[PDB]
Amino acid sequence: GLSDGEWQQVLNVWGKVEADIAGHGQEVLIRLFTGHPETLEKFDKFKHLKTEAEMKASEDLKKHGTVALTALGGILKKKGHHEAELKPLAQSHATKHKIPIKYLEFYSDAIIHVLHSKHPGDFGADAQGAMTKALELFRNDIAAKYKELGFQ
Ligand code: HEM
Ligand SMILES: O=N[O-]
Ligand SMILES: [S]
Numbered sequence: 001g002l003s004d005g006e007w008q009q010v011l012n013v014w015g016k017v018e019a020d021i022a023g024h025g026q027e028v029l030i031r032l033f034t035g036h037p038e039t040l041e042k043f044d045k046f047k048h049l050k051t052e053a054e055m056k057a058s059e060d061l062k063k064h065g066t067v068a069l070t071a072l073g074g075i076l077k078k079k080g081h082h083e084a085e086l087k088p089l090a091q092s093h094a095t096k097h098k099i100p101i102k103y104l105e106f107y108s109d110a111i112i113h114v115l116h117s118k119h120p121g122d123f124g125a126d127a128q129g130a131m132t133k134a135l136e137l138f139r140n141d142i143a144a145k146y147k148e149l150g151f152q
Contacts, residue, residue: 002133007079009130014076016119017069024114025065030055031110032103039103072111076134082141090145094152101143101152108135 002010017024033040034052041047046064049055071089075082093099112132115123123131146152 001080002130002137006130006133009127010076010134013115013123013127013131014073016115016122017073021069021073022062022066024118025067025069026056026062027065027114027118028069028107028110029061029065031113032107035110036103036106039106042097042099042103072138075138080137082138086138086141086145090142091149093142094146094149098151101139101146104139104142108132108139111135 029046030052033046033049033055040049043064046055046058046061049058049061055061071085075085078085093104112128112135115128115131143152
């Protein structure tokens with residue numbers, strides 16, 4: 001788990017996302033898709049996009065970015081007591097969307113990158129530590145459900 005101090009830092013950083021959830025959610029998926037084009041292939045409805053500019057221009061991409069980061073935000077605000085929130089995501093991502101856990105690692109990395117890129121000099125070493133631990137906690141708990149489902 002995380003200490004109370006660490007959860008405080010996590011949710012303080014999340015304040016930055018909450019002020020522009022769609023812009024942050026869009027940049028996260030653009031960073032995913034451009035750094036790891038295999039990820040793009042899991043979305044039939046984005047799979048049409050060839051270029052980053054079409055990605056930037058895509059209002060449905062922004063919308064999905066909003067859906068995804070809102071769901072992460074809700075999970076983070078449970079400070080690890082997130083069993084009921086994780087279950088359906090584990091199930092849909094492992095069994096319907098067929099998303100290898102490695103791609104959730106790429107996604108977590110993309111969140112860190114995007115925070116530094118939008119807030120350079122304002123995402124301090126303590127905050128990156130705490131945010132990385134929360135994301136790892138999420139991945140570990142999801143990984144347990146994937147194992148249960150035989151996906152990984
Ligand atoms: C923190 C990580 C993530 C969160 C919180 C998240 C959340 C969500 C949510 C709330 C939905 C809609 C509800 C559902 O289908 O369960 C969704 C749909 C989906 N997610 Fe994720 N997701 C995450 C990571 C990923 C990653 C890494 C990928 C692929 C590389 C992915 C692929 C998808 C796909 C394909 C859909 C279906 C999209 C559609 O409507 O056509 N997700 N995600
Ligand atoms: O909760 N103090 O690390
Ligand atoms: S997603």
